[PDB]
Design a protein around this ligand. Structure first.
Ligand SMILES: CC(C)CCCCCCC[C@@H](C)CCC[C@@H](C)CCO[C@H](CO)COCC[C@@H](C)CCC[C@H](C)CCC[C@@H](C)CCCC(C)C
Ligand SMILES: CC(C)CCCCCCC[C@@H](C)CCC[C@@H](C)CCO[C@H](CO)COCC[C@@H](C)CCC[C@H](C)CCC[C@@H](C)CCCC(C)C
Ligand SMILES: CC(C)CCCCCCC[C@@H](C)CCC[C@@H](C)CCO[C@H](CO)COCC[C@@H](C)CCC[C@H](C)CCC[C@@H](C)CCCC(C)C
Ligand SMILES: CC(C)CCCCCCC[C@@H](C)CCC[C@@H](C)CCO[C@H](CO)COCC[C@@H](C)CCC[C@H](C)CCC[C@@H](C)CCCC(C)C
Ligand SMILES: CC(C)CCCCCCC[C@@H](C)CCC[C@@H](C)CCO[C@H](CO)COCC[C@@H](C)CCC[C@H](C)CCC[C@@H](C)CCCC(C)C
Ligand SMILES: CC(C)CCCCCCC[C@@H](C)CCC[C@@H](C)CCO[C@H](CO)COCC[C@@H](C)CCC[C@H](C)CCC[C@@H](C)CCCC(C)C
Ligand SMILES: CC(C)CCCCCCC[C@@H](C)CCC[C@@H](C)CCO[C@H](CO)COCC[C@@H](C)CCC[C@H](C)CCC[C@@H](C)CCCC(C)C
Ligand SMILES: CC(C)CCCCCCC[C@@H](C)CCC[C@@H](C)CCO[C@H](CO)COCC[C@@H](C)CCC[C@H](C)CCC[C@@H](C)CCCC(C)C
Ligand SMILES: CC(C)CCCCCCC[C@@H](C)CCC[C@@H](C)CCO[C@H](CO)COCC[C@@H](C)CCC[C@H](C)CCC[C@@H](C)CCCC(C)C
Ligand SMILES: CC(C)CCCCCCC[C@@H](C)CCC[C@@H](C)CCO[C@H](CO)COCC[C@@H](C)CCC[C@H](C)CCC[C@@H](C)CCCC(C)C
Ligand SMILES: CC(C)CCCCCCC[C@@H](C)CCC[C@@H](C)CCO[C@H](CO)COCC[C@@H](C)CCC[C@H](C)CCC[C@@H](C)CCCC(C)C
Ligand SMILES: CC(C)CCCCCCCCCCCC[C@@H](C)CCCCCCCC(C)C
Ligand SMILES: CC(C)CCCCCCCCCCCC[C@@H](C)CCCCCCCC(C)C
Ligand SMILES: CC(C)CCCCCCCCCCCC[C@@H](C)CCCCCCCC(C)C
Ligand SMILES: *C/C=C(C)/C=C/C=C(C)/C=C/C1=C(C)CCCC1(C)C
Ligand SMILES: *C/C=C(C)/C=C/C=C(C)/C=C/C1=C(C)CCCC1(C)C
Ligand SMILES: *C/C=C(C)/C=C/C=C(C)/C=C/C1=C(C)CCCC1(C)C
Lengths: 222, 222, 222
């Protein structure tokens, strides 16, 4: 449309759809329950992102938030996406290393707080307070990153793939608060179309690229 | 009230309440954890539907969606219902056959996508796009139906009851996209009061009738 | 601010933050998976409440509901809080006594209905109907309380601590429908600032005081 960010929403929709179908079909012929768990998780993530990208593309997942005086376009739908897909991603990680249930609950819960406070910050109409929600969310994120590094005798195939995904995770997820901060969501240094670009590249890498790495490894098979 | 569909919301409220109390009391005197699981799931479903029917009845779960120019009455509350009650129903099925966790996650996730895209379609103000959400939702549904048929040495009592519920499920759930499509939610061929009627008959059959069948079987006992 | 209830939202924010950090740090040095489960659950609860208190404090989690003619301030954010934190609290209880999965689902589900109907009642614009939602919610509550008392050979350390928390639970949770009923949410007998006070004292006691009791016991260690 007339939304210059449309092309990135379009590309994101397509690439999340294609990764969904790739992983869906790829997961055809899997019988191992454990592999089945990662296929389910890992196919669902871009499946959900596909729907939320499409909802952004079609304009459904977009709202206007008054702040700085202005009517600030906020694609709220990506938080609906992340609300489900980031814990699923963490679940992929958590299951890989067979985390304790307490640790998984800590991660999912901290994740829900990260996304929920990010959404609150995204929709907050007092500009200064946006960054307060950003900060708390970032602290939840740093908590999660902490746990992924200092809280986790697995088979070497698990380890190796975990350590790759874990590095992928930390590098990509850490970029999101920066994009939010510098983008139209936060301080407005970088335009919406570029923030949308950045998040789409991160999301495809964090969802499809992550899943390609994961669904490639024998780590997912018992 | 003046809502001609009220009587069906009224009847649905009553019948979901009565089925809730029937299953609640019926489940009094159950000690087997497994039976306890199906009683919990199966009582919760019409309990939730009771609340959402009442919310529709009282007008709370109703909104107006602009499309075709018009202010289209949309009872959004039934999606809040379904969001919780359809995965629970699938969980009843999944537990019956002791599904793999991956398969359950696939079902619940596909279900959330079915309902969430149905809700997005229901609230979408671009009329043509409504049916795009319908189509994706329908594809999630067909995925679920696929899985219920081609993805599931259980005791013959499990099998038999599973196969009955599974047929009940497929026939009733398949009717909902058709009702949505032809009803005021979709193409508007059939009035809101008749769509509300149709969904109430399906919902009572899919919740109370389903639960009667299930809570009747010894399949639910270990 | 000019919201006389601000001080209580401020105090609640602070005390939930401080309890979050206390339990977070306190939980440093825990390795027992079971203890890890209660630390996770129990730290998350005031962590979530911290965010929702702050959201109330900052004015984000506040809406106006027309009823009696008036624009009635409703802090909806505490229902978002409770939606997650009350099942977690019940989960703390449920895990303590190793409840059956069916019973946990019954509790969480009844809880979701309690909070969801309380939120519906809170946002309902027909004043009389508010108390209908109150009544149903109260019945869900009484169901939960029923289950906590008549539905649960645990080690004596479990029992004892369970029985204390269970009494804490019943006494504190029972006060909330009364506060809602007499407060600005319900019949308006007691002002918003006092209802906010009352709920803050209950919430801190039910979250931090509860968690102090729990995270003090050896009941949480296998
Ligand atoms: C747990 C574990 C962790 C707890 C999380 C801690 C922080 C919780 C914050 C919550 C807040 C939720 C945001 C939303 C409810 C508030 C909407 O109010 C907006 C701002 O006034 C309204 O503007 C416009 C409204 C905008 C629309 C918002 C859409 C969002 C919805 C995403 C959820 C979906 C659920 C499935 C639906 C099918
Ligand atoms: C240690 C604490 C617990 C951590 C919590 C951090 C709270 C975040 C700070 C929020 C607040 C102090 C910033 C307010 C913006 C201020 C610098 C600009 C002047 O205010 C203007 C209106 O008066 C903003 O309009 C528009 C001007 C804008 C273009 C200015 C952009 C603001 C940016 C704020 C970025 C904060 C992060 C970089 C924090 C870094 C860590
Ligand atoms: C340690 C952390 C707590 C941060 C301390 C804060 C100091 C209190 O804020 C005052 C300074 O204006 C008054 O705010 C009054 C205006 C507003 C009230 C302030 C509420 C929030 C600014 C304070 C809540 C803590 C922040 C959270 C930062 C994220 C943290 C987890 C890293
Ligand atoms: C996306 C940007 C535009 C491009 C940035 C490219 C940076 C390249 C990433 C390199 C990192 C990966 C490290 C190599 C790997 C091997 C490490 O494995 C170690 C062995 O267990 C793990 O220990 C400990 C593991 C350590 C790895 C933790 C990663 C840290 C995060 C480093 C970057 C941060 C994200 C950048 C934020 C910026 C975009 C605002
Ligand atoms: C997972 C697994 C799968 C992921 C699902 C993929 C698709 C996700 C779609 C989501 C969208 C949610 C709909 C809602 C948040 C959007 C509301 O915006 C409306 C349309 O502009 C506003 O009009 C009027 C608003 C209307 C009100 C909508 C009510 C709905 C709320 C139902 C959820 C409840 C949660 C528990 C509450 C207690
Ligand atoms: C193969 C694809 C991937 C599948 C995706 C399917 C997308 C759904 C089609 C949507 C769109 C083409 C239909 C638009 C309605 C069009 C026929 C009527 C003319 O447009 C009018 C406004 O210009 C509609 O107003 C009002 C007129 C209405 C009364 C017309 C009702 C429309 C109906 C559409 C029903 C579509 C389903 C039957 C698809 C069957 C499978
Ligand atoms: C609700 C409507 C108004 C009334 C429609 C009445 C149709 C009667 C339903 C019959 C069906 C049940 C089949 C008999 C049963 C026995 C089958 O068991 C088989 C043995 O394992 C299962 O194999 C494979 C199982 C096969 C069963 C799958 C069912 C398919 C769905 C068939 C109908 C579709 C729904 C109708 C959509 C319409 C309302 C738009
Ligand atoms: C399960 C198990 C049990 C099922 C529960 C049975 C009862 C379900 C009731 C549900 C209703 C949800 C309330 C909300 C969706 C309805 C919003 O409509 C309001 C009233 O017209 C709009 O005013 C203003 C809107 C106000 C904002 C409401 C905020 C609420 C959101 C809290 C959820 C959050 C989810 C995570 C977000 C991140
Ligand atoms: C056995 C049933 C299944 C249980 C369901 C209970 C339904 C709750 C009753 C709702 C309704 C009868 C009460 C309506 C308020 C009425 C007493 C006051 C007169 O109506 C006024 C407008 O006409 C209310 O405006 C404003 C006046 C207000 C200040 C009056 C406050 C109303 C209060 C209602 C409190 C009800 C609980 C105490 C129930 C106790 C158990
Ligand atoms: C037993 C329980 C059911 C309560 C019976 C009700 C009686 C029907 O309400 C009529 C009296 O005005 C008509 O309401 C018409 C106006 C409105 C319609 C009434 C709907 C609700 C008032 C009735 C639903 C039951 C209530 C729930 C009370 C909580 C219960 C679980 C304890
Ligand atoms: C918060 C208010 C302002 C202050 C109210 C102070 C009341 C004092 C609470 C005492 C209670 C605790 C009972 C002692 C304990 C020991 C009981 O253990 C028994 C041994 O298994 C359990 O059997 C069965 C256990 C029995 C305990 C169930 C508790 C019941 C609830 C009693 C009060 C109710 C809540 C008050 C509502 C009011 C605030 C509207
Ligand atoms: C087996 C594979 C590679 C899967 C292909 C199926 C569908 C597409 C997904 C694969 C694409 C990219 C891999 C993930 C990493 C990323 C950095 C993607 C960034 C996307 C940018 C838009 C267009 C660029 C492309 C060259 C993919
Ligand atoms: C043991 C039983 C049958 C349960 C009775 C408790 C409460 C009511 C539920 C039972 C009713 C119906 C069975 C489910 C199937 C359906 C097709 C119901 C359609 C409902 C239509 C409205 C009025 C019709 C009735 C004759 C029930
Ligand atoms: C080890 C302990 C006690 C924890 C301290 C960390 C942070 C604060 C939480 C402890 C405070 C209170 C215990 C819970 C019980 C309550 C009745 C609290 C009611 C709060 C009222 C506001 C100010 C009062 C205080 C004296 C705490
Ligand atoms: C699938 C998409 C992924 C993996 C998205 C990850 C997003 C995050 C790690 C976002 C974190 C944010 C913060 C730490 C603070 C500001 C708000 C967020 C939500 C952008
Ligand atoms: C308890 C009620 C039940 C079992 C409801 C089931 C509803 C569905 C199977 C609905 C499916 C739909 C589609 C496939 C597309 C259009 C939207 C829906 C949500 C009506
Ligand atoms: C953390 C906060 C806690 C433990 C809150 C508990 C709240 C309840 C037990 C609330 C119950 C209510 C009813 C029974 C009816 C009216 C509405 C509620 C939600 C206040």
């Amino acid at each position: 449309t007339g939304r210059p960010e449309w092309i990135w929403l379009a590309l994101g929709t397509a690439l999340m759809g294609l990764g969904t179908l790739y992983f869906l079909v790829k997961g055809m012929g899997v019988s191992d329950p454990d592999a089945k768990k990662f296929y389910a998780i890992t196919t669902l993530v871009p499946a959900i992102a596909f729907t939320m990208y499409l909802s952004m593309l079609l304009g459904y997942g977009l709202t206007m938030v008054p702040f700085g005086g202005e009517q600030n376009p906020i694609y709220w739908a990506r938080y609906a996406d992340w609300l489900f897909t980031t814990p699923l991603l963490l679940l992929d990680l958590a299951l890989l290393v067979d985390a304790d249930q307490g640790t998984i609950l800590a991660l999912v819960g901290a994740d829900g707080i990260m996304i929920g406070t990010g959404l609150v910050g995204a929709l907050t109409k007092v500009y200064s307070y946006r960054f307060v929600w950003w900060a708390i969310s970032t602290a939840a994120m740093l908590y999660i990153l902490y746990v992924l590094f200092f809280g986790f005798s697995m088979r070497p195939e698990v380890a190796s793939t975990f350590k790759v995904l874990r590095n992928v995770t930390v590098v990509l997820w850490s970029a999101y608060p920066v994009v939010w901060l510098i983008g139209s969501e936060g301080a407005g240094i970088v335009p919406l179309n570029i923030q949308t670009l950045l998040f789409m590249v991160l999301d495809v890498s964090a969802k499809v690229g992550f899943g390609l790495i994961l669904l490639r490894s024998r780590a997912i098979f018992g």
